[PDB]
Amino acid sequence: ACDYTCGSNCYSSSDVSTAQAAGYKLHEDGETVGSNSYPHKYNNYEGFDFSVSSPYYEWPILSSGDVYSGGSPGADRVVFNENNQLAGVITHTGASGNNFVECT
């Protein structure tokens, strides 16, 4: 079973934990990867009910299970805050333009 489902992509809690670890470490190092410079700030204009406080940061989680290293980020993201707490798993899949919907 999938702990999070983004469109047709399935992720386990281990895939989320691995992606968050890598994105939080670049945050601590003041570094980014990719054309679109991840991790970068996430603003909750859609009003998702995250129970952790901002600032929030978004980082790609890949369907392949590999940690994002630059290259196409795909449509899925883990969102974490400044204290390295998981906020949620969201996706551009099924949302117009640059908006997002939450993974279920």
Report 23-82 residues binding Zn ion (CB under 5 A). 65
40 is catalytic: yes
Q: Counting contacts by CB under 5 A, is residue 15 touching Zn ion? A: yes
With CA atoms as reference, report the closest residue to 61 among 96, 27, 88.
Answer: 88
Collapse the DSSP code of 21 into the 3-class scheme (helix H, G, I; strand E, B; otherwise coil) and give the result: helix
Would residue 92 show up in a list of annotated catalytic residues for this protein? yes
Q: Which of 40, 46, 82, 102 is catalytic?
A: 40
With contacts defined by CB under 5 A, how many residues of the chain interact with Zn ion?
A: 2
| β-sheet with 40-42: strand ranges across | 40-42, 56-60, 76-81, 86-91, 101-102
Active site amino acids = 40, 58, 92
| Interacting residues with Zn ion (CB under 5 A) | 15, 65
